[PDB]
Each structure stands twice: as structure tokens, then as C-alpha cells.
Amino acid sequence: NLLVTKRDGSTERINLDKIHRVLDWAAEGLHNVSISQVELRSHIQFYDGIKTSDIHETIIKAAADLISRDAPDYQYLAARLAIFHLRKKAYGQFEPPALYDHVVKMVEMGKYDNHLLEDYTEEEFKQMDTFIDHDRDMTFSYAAVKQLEG
């Protein structure tokens, strides 16, 4: 009967199936990992109004510390969980925006260099968006992803 606080501020009833779905996705294709281990090692302390973004960061830490010689594939489970969390932090969703739409907003915010818009045209930016393979974020290890966001 308790409520979790979603990323957009709204709330809904706590559903552990949401957590099972995320972990089953992150453990897909991996060998010798355990959804149950990640949930139990999280020691996640629920309370009414718990932020859903803090919940996810907990299971990333838990899966990251399970990296061992006997279970080396946790380096990919924790990485896939970390990429997922990092997509939401920057975009609010999973799919990244277009390369042009992003550079426009970022140069406008002063976070990117001004020359990106001057030296490349929108037709050129869309052509490089076809080069991008956003599925290559699924080939990182957890140590790589933490150095990326860090």
C-alpha cells in the first residue's frame, strides 16, 4: 500500500515486478548471475515515498560488488544497469535524442563549444547520427561506465 516516487515526480503503488523486469533484462544472456542475489544484496530499505532513482542506484551498487572470479559476468550486468540509469539522468528516457537536437540544446546551454553548429550543417549532423551505434553502450564493463559518468 506504500508509494514510490517516479522520476517525473508522480507516485504509484510499489511493484517489485518492475525490479524483477529490470534485472532480468540486465542479466539476459549472462552466465552465472543471480537476480535474487542482486535484490537481496541491495538490502534496499523501503519507505513510503522512496525515490525510484535512489532505488536503481542501490541495485547497481549491489550488482557491482558481486563481481568475482566465480561470477565475472556481473561486470556486464552492473554495466547494463548503469547505462540504463545514465540514459534517464541525461534524457529522462532510454532512447537518446537526435545528434542535432542534442548539440543544439547543449550549445544553447553553454555546455558544448559554439563551433559545433558553425562547422557542421544539420544535413551533416544527421549523416553522422547514422554512424552512431547506441547498442555499443552494451559492450562496456561496469568499471568503464563508472569512469564515464564520474
Binding site: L16, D17, H20, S34, I35, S36, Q37, L40, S42
Partner: protein, 357 residues
């Protein structure tokens, strides 16, 4: 005819495990198969009482559980009470009249006794988490999801006890009992024993360990920890129990004890395989019932069903049966923690001088 003290002086070391001369003198200075003497010594060393465990804090944890998790916990407790209720009396009733070596006789009696401690501890746990224990106990016999497997498990025991009575009352041969013809085959009795032990092995090595997953999954959340200490003690005995049945089954299957038995064990291989597969399917269905109203952190239908397939392959391999499920890594690795216990500053310039930069 069974006798509590057989008059014949038999060399107990040459008797078989079953169907030989009834044990007369109970001596423990020598053994034919010393595996059972070790099981006795180890079970006697594990002696524990339920009251010596603090379970008072568990009531707080139980009442704070979600409504469907009270059900998950209390259903696994009703099922546990039923299995170890059967296991309290059955090895004594079903095996003692057949045993013919003293070490196996005494082990079965120690095995059975240790099961009554489990039954007493379930009364201990129940009396400390629920308000009216009668609510839990009265549901055990009528429960639909339980009584299906309850009557199936007890049947292997009941049938072995019945054939044993005919074999003792009438002996081997074709008999007539009130008109109807009754055939008493020792080979058919040896077949009902082997099937029973197989059913008991699946009962204690698969059915209970699926239950262990439920009890210990709550403990990984630091909930029901008084229960977890008792279930941990039970799990330590349960490892001794299934080891006993494994050695019995393998000694019968390998024909070391009875040349006839090695052949009979092969005639049952398909029936025994179906026996284990049915047990594994029954527990997966039981898992489907536990999580019908929701799951919990670390355990759902998938996780528990994966452990059913995982532990079944392990148990069936130990008794020489074909693996019915795909190879799989342990889906709940956390359960294993519950089932097993300056500068040497001296310089030598001459040695350094032997150098060319």
C-alpha cells in the same frame, strides 16, 4: 513372521541391509556399512532443542509483512509441518521390520527421532508468530495444494507397510485370503522398498530444499530470524537424512548388498525417473501457488522454479538417474551459507662492481 529378538545367532556383518534376519543384539563396535554408524554419530552430535532458540522477535517481523507474504511464509510452514509429520513416524514404521543389520536399524530410529524434534520446532515457531496456532494446524490436513502431495507421498510408505505385513504374516507364495487370491512376492517387496526410498530421497532432498529457499529468503532480509535459526538446524539434519537414503539407494542399485536387487533397481529406473520428475513438477506448481498474489525481494515463481530444476538435477545425479532439466547455475547462491557450515640496508660494492653499464 517378525520377531523383536531373533533366536538364531547370525553373523551380522554378512546380513544384507534389508529382508535378512531381524536384528537381535544391538552392537556398535563393528559395522557392515559404516556410513550409517557415522550418520548416527553426526546426528547425535547435532542434537538441538527448539526452545533453545529465541523466536520472540519473529512475531514483530511477521505482523509487519505484507498480506501476501504472510501467506507465502505460513504456507511453507504448513507444508513443512506436514512433511516432517510424515517423516516423524514413517521411517520407523516402514523400515524397522525390514532392517537386518544393527547400524542401519539404529540409524533409522535416530533419523526418525530427529524428525520429531523438527515437528516440535514447527509447533514452537507457529506458537510464536501467529495468535491462534489452531488456525495453522487445522488447515494442514484439508489444504488442497498440500493434501495432493500429502497422499502421494504417504502412499509409497503405506504400500510398503502393507506388503511387509503380508510378507510377515503369510510368507512368500500364492495365497488365498477370503476367496480372493493374494500373491506375496519378495521381489515385489524389494521393488516397493526401492521405490519408497526413492520417493523419500526426493522428499528430503528436493521438496524440503525448495522449502528451505523460502524460509532463508526471508532471513536474507533479516526477517523471521528466529525461524531461520531453527530451519538452519533442520537443514543440517536434512543433509544427514538424504545422505542416508542416498547410500541405501546406491548400495541397493550397485548390488553390493543383494545381487537380485541390482537387477530390480534397473527395472525401476524409469518409474523412479518419473517419480522425481513428478515431484519437481509438483513443487513448481506449489511455487506457482505461493506467488499468486505477489512476490518478494529475492524470490518469485521464476527464481524458485529455477532452483527446483537446479536442485533436482543434483539429487537425481547422486542416485544414478538421468537429468530431466537443462544444466543451470545456482539461481540462489546465497542459500549455501545456510546449508553448509623494513630494508636490509647492507650493500656490497664488490658484487655491484661486477657490472658493466
Amino acid at each position: 513372521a517378525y520377531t523383536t529378538f531373533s533366536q538364531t545367532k547370525n553373523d551380522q556383518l554378512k546380513e544384507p541391509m534389508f529382508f535378512g534376519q531381524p536384528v537381535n543384539v544391538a552392537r556398535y563396535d563393528q559395522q557392515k556399512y559404516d556410513i550409517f554408524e557415522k550418520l548416527i554419530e553426526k546426528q547425535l552430535s547435532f542434537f538441538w532443542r527448539p526452545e533453545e532458540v529465541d523466536v520472540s522477535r519473529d512475531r514483530i517481523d511477521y505482523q509487519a509483512l505484507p498480506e501476501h507474504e504472510k501467506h507465502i511464509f505460513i504456507s511453507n510452514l504448513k507444508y513443512q509441518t506436514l512433511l516432517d509429520s510424515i517423516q516423524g513416524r514413517s521411517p520407523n514404521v516402514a523400515l524397522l521390520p525390514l532392517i537386518s543389520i544393527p547400524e542401519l536399524e539404529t540409524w533409522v530410529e535416530t533419523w526418525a527421532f530427529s524428525e520429531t524434534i523438527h515437528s516440535r520446532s514447527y509447533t514452537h515457531i507457529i506458537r510464536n508468530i501467529v495468535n491462534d496456532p489452531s488456525v495453522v494446524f487445522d488447515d494442514i490436513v484439508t489444504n488442497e495444494q498440500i493434501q495432493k502431495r500429502a497422499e502421494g507421498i504417504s502412499s509409497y510408505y503405506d504400500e510398503l507397510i502393507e506388503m511387509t505385513s503380508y510378507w510377515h504374516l503369510l510368507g512368500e507364495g500364492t495365497h488365498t485370503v477370503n476367496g480372493k487370491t493374494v500373491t506375496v512376492s519378495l521381489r515385489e517387496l524389494k521393488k516397493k522398498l526401492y521405490l519408497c526410498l526413492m520417493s523419500v530421497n526426493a522428499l528430503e532432498a528436493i521438496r524440503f530444499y525448495v522449502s528451505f529457499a523460502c524460509s532463508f529468503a526471508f532471513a536474507e532480509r533479516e526477517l523471521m530470524e528466529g525461524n531461520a535459526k531453527i530451519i538452519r538446524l533442520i537443514a543440517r539434519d536434512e543433509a544427514l537424512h538424504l545422505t542416508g537414503t542416498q547410500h541405501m539407494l546406491n548400495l541397493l542399485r550397485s548390488g553390493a548388498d543383494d545381487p537380485e536387487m541390482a537387477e530390480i533397481a534397473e527395472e525401476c529406473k524409469q518409474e523412479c525417473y518419473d517419480l522425481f520428475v513428478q515431484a519437481a513438477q509438483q513443487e513448481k506448481d506449489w511455487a506457482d501457488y505461493l506467488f499468486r498474489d505477489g512476490s518478494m525481494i529475492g524470490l518469485n515463481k521464476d527464481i524458485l522454479c529455477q532452483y527446483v530444476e537446479y536442485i533436482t538435477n543434483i539429487r537425481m545425479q547422486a542416485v544414478g538417474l538421468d537429468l530431466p532439466f537443462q544444466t543451470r547455475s545456482n539461481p540462489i547462491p546465497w542459500i549455501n551459507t545456510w546449508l553448509v557450515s623494513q630494508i636490509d640496508s647492507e650493500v656490497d660494492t664488490d658484487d655491484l662492481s661486477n657490472f658493466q653499464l
